């Protein structure tokens, strides 16, 4: 869809549109090639959707904090 819940657009609509624009700019003759060229934009969209890198960073910080506290 792309529409928001309260109004406007979805929380991560713009990141997806960025990736789509990048694919449109690319001249690769196959979609697979274009996705390979635009993979970094897809990684940004996935990062905004789930915040996996931020979760890993928080996990590492918490774990080190626990190690310092125990010592």
């Amino acid at each position: 869809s792309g529409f928001g819940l309260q109004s406007g657009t979805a929380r991560c609509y713009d990141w997806y549109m960025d990736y789509l624009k990048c694919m449109d700019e690319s001249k690769a003759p196959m979609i697979t090639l274009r996705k390979q060229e635009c993979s970094e934009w897809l990684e940004d969209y996935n990062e905004c959707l789930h915040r996996d890198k931020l979760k890993l960073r928080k996990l590492l910080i918490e774990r080190e904090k626990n190690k310092q506290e125990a010592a």
């Binding site: 869809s1 529409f3 928001g4 819940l5 309260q6 979805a10 929380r11 991560c12 959707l49």
Partner: protein
């Protein structure tokens, strides 16, 4: 450490269990046709709930529209199936005993 991660895991476990209980429940514990359609409804409701959950997660309306579609189609399918079940039961011959219980 994070309540939302725990709650998300609990929700995922619950919804998956409800789906499998709906799809395979009535067949596993052999039941009548009416119970099969009720468990099919339970499964469709589970999927629609998953779509509503996704819509809340992504702040998107697509799941809410798929879910209203599920509600409509599921009710139409149930009404038609129940009509078929009644017609099947009214045509049963005297010899037939558990006509509704095909899985017997």
């Amino acid at each position: 450490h994070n309540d939302a991660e725990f709650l998300g895991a609990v929700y995922n476990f619950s919804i998956r269990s409800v789906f499998i209980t709906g799809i395979l429940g009535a067949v596993y514990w052999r039941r009548n046709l009416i119970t099969m359609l009720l468990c099919s409804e339970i499964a469709f409701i589970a999927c629609s709930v998953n779509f509503l959950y996704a819509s809340a997660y992504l702040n998107d309306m697509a799941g809410m529209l798929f879910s209203i579609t599920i509600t409509t189609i599921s009710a139409c399918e149930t009404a038609l199936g129940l009509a078929l079940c009644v017609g099947y039961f009214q045509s049963r011959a005297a010899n037939e005993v558990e006509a509704l219980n095909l899985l017997k």
